[PDB]
Write a protein that binds this ligand. Structure first.
Ligand SMILES: CCCc1cc(=O)oc2c(C(=O)N3CCCc4ccccc43)c(OCCN3CCN(C)CC3)ccc12
Ligand SMILES: CCCc1cc(=O)oc2c(C(=O)N3CCCc4ccccc43)c(OCCN3CCN(C)CC3)ccc12
Ligand SMILES: Nc1ncnc2c1ncn2[C@@H]1O[C@H](COP(=O)(O)OP(=O)(O)NP(=O)(O)O)[C@@H](O)[C@H]1O
Ligand SMILES: Nc1ncnc2c1ncn2[C@@H]1O[C@H](COP(=O)(O)OP(=O)(O)NP(=O)(O)O)[C@@H](O)[C@H]1O
Ligand SMILES: [Mg+2]
Ligand SMILES: [Mg+2]
Lengths: 388, 388
């Protein structure tokens, strides 16, 4: 092999297709137990087989829609549509559209810049302490790159125009945008056909659809003040507590007693529910409407408080040494939080790494919450084990 | 705020400094319990305060040295030097140097291309099934960018020349390389002064030095056939079992009985040790000499086999329902493996996501290993709990 064959340079766009894993996650199938929203049983925990990268390109567009609530607090609605037969996904939101105007530095229309060029974002000035999920300037381009067709439609009354542009063939082909007079209610709609060949798939199957559907339920629970519709029907979830009920309202512990679920909205930025786990530590958490499926410092921050107080309670009845990991082993925690300028160790944002001192707010759970936590069966489970 | 202030485009080099977390991990301090190699006590588990990104720029250069064993199986030695007072770290390796010749496409010297330009690698052709840790073409440039001074010295008898070039100021300044006749034993030496201001540090303190030192011990344990020296002294670790002994040889269980440690070299590519954990599930694992500190599919692959067999053993004595997570709760596993073309969800490579069918080898543990595993106290701990 010559020097030029061994030592190679790639462009950024080449690198994304060659090394998708750090951008969107694995492009190969994964089987694991997780929660999905199925057509027959609704929310349930089962083995699911799906391609992470396909989940993530959908998630990037969904979180971008949620992020628009920060740009326009008057936004009220996100509508998600998935048609497996035609292979078309659309995510629509109201509130302010994107300025339909030429960027005076980049010399292209703003929507074309931020959907068609890498490393473009409204989230690069961190002196603005924002609680958007967007941070890196990649997500929408990654969806475009992994789509055979990707259409951006946006209408912005302030600029008196609507914009529609379509990319094809993994963001490699496009054509002139359609610009028209607009004076109505603003919106943005992203419509895409995922490139299933990139994921070794023939069709959007039941498992990936059930996962994407569950993300829409997540958003109904996590994004305050935004209603979510899925395939033309409003999701009947009106806040985080009602979302948590989808997991725990009909569940019993192993002794046949209903799970006792405790809740506190500590402040606008921290919503916490807690109950007993009999399957080891479990957390369901969102940072800025991102599902932090590997957790992070926000989970540790909440859990450590509970663990500390419950250790105190057990100690007043253990006259041996009960260890924090043993207490955490019995906790199922649900957290919805808003973090200023969060950091993550990957574009997929599964693990939120920002230290609590930088969150921009605190979650100081009340003594009433801690007393309630001491009554949800965790203390009993620890004490019963102190006999062994 | 105008359109041009809100919507911004960044260059790749700008993006790395603005968003370091997905490239090198957090640039803010972290405190956590982990294993380090201290000057007073050697290997020990304690709270450590360190900046992950600084650990990682060192790790990138260390794993690059280990990777040279794949390019030249005759390599025998890596030498690591850390001087906190002068702020100089050097990592030297023998075996083949890098070709000191002009790349005919990029029109620069090969070492200058692959240490001074982003997205450059010898690991971009995946039809070669390699067991190097390098995959993405970033690591060495990331160290350069996060260094106030970064020097590459390499000597390659085949090309009859040595090369020395220095970059300064976060890879923003350099000068003409020094090219000289060379006809001796090949080597490469990377010498850098980390930009501590990027990590809000004044000096390489005891904690970061103890972590970097431990990585050198890891390499002595993980990289077959390569001796490691640290500050001029050979590390007395001669293979993976002797490395594992640093953790477990002097440890007792809570009843005062020495931990029973079982071992199998299943084949050249899989080395496994196992013992009892009393602190919840624990794994220490390496993929291609990378410390996979969040685990991955290689850990699950090994652990699931053990868990399955131990469930069988318990069942022959539990005449209630013992769950896999309960068995895993008692496992401390150590794994050193070589995986073809591994994938990870981040440049920091903490979590290896490649599915087992793609590993290029299997680890089928023997019935003798499983019998030994049934005698290391895990089964006893599970059964004792079956009484409760
Ligand atoms: C690569 C993508 C991985 C992933 C994507 C995704 O969307 O959800 C995931 C969820 C999950 O379903 N949820 C539900 C709500 C969103 C959320 C936020 C944080 C944590 C979890 C979740 C998940 O749950 C595992 C549940 N355990 C399974 C068995 N175990 C014993 C106990 C429970 C594991 C991975 C994912
Ligand atoms: C951001 C960087 C994080 C990190 C970097 C690094 O180098 O090592 C780490 C290790 C660690 O020391 N080792 C030792 C050898 C290399 C290795 C490979 C896989 C897993 C672990 C490790 C670590 O251990 C936690 C040990 N538990 C702590 C308490 N707990 C109850 C039980 C034990 C946690 C994080 C890191
Ligand atoms: N639905 C939307 N409504 C309004 N603006 C949007 C919408 N979707 C995307 N944008 C804009 O397009 C930009 C680019 O989106 P994207 O590529 O996802 O980057 P990001 O969200 O800023 N960061 P990240 O998702 O972490 O890579 C965003 O910064 C927003 O300004
Ligand atoms: N010590 C070394 N000896 C020989 N070649 C080296 C050495 N260090 C680096 N290289 C070469 O320099 C290239 C660039 O290194 P690097 O930037 O770390 O990328 P990588 O190791 O290929 N992939 P990654 O580390 O995953 O970003 C490697 O691909 C090797 O060809
Ligand atoms: Mg985004
Ligand atoms: Mg490398």
């Amino acid at each position: 092999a010559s020097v030029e064959r061994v030592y190679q340079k790639k462009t950024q766009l080449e690198h994304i297709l060659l090394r998708p894993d750090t951008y969107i996650g694995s492009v190969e199938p994964l089987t694991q137990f997780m929660w999905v929203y199925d057509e027959d049983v609704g929310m349930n925990c089962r083995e699911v087989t799906f391609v992470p990268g396909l989940y993530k390109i959908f998630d990037e567009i969904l979180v971008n829609a949620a992020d628009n609530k920060q740009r326009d607090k008057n936004m009220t609605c996100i509508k998600v549509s998935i048609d497996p037969e035609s292979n078309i996904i659309s995510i629509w939101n109201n509130g302010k559209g994107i300025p339909v105007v030429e960027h005076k530095v980049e010399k292209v229309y703003v929507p074309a810049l931020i959907f068609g060029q890498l490393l473009t974002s409204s989230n690069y000035d961190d002196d603005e302490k924002k609680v958007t999920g967007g941070r890196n300037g990649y997500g929408a381009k990654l969806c475009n790159i992994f789509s055979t067709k990707f259409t951006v439609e946006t209408a912005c009354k302030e600029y008196k125009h609507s914009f529609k542009q379509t990319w094809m063939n993994n963001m490699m082909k496009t054509s002139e945008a359609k610009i028209k007079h607009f004076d109505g209610e603003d919106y943005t709609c992203i419509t895409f056909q995922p490139d299933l060949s990139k994921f070794k798939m023939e069709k959007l199957d039941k498992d990936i659809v059930a996962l994407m559907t569950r993300r829409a339920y997540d958003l109904a629970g996590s994004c305050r003040g935004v209603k979510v519709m899925f395939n033309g029907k409003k999701l009947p979830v009106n806040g985080f507590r009602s979302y948590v009920d989808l997991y725990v309202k009909d569940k019993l512990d192993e002794t046949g007693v209903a799970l006792k679920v405790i809740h506190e909205l500590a402040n606008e930025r921290w919503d916490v529910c807690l109950t007993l786990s009999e399957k080891g530590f479990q957390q369901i958490s969102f940072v800025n409407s991102i599902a932090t499926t590997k957790g992070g410092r926000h989970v540790d921050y909440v859990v450590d408080q509970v663990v500390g107080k419950l250790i105190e309670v057990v100690k007043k009845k253990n006259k041996v040494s009960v260890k924090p990991f043993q207490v955490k082993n019995h906790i199922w925690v649900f957290i919805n939080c808003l973090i200023e300028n969060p950091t993550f160790d990957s574009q997929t944002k599964e693990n939120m790494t920002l230290q609590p001192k930088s969150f921009g707010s605190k979650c100081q759970l009340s003594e009433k919450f801690f007393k309630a936590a001491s009554n949800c069966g965790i203390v009993e489970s620890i004490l019963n084990w102190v006999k062994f």
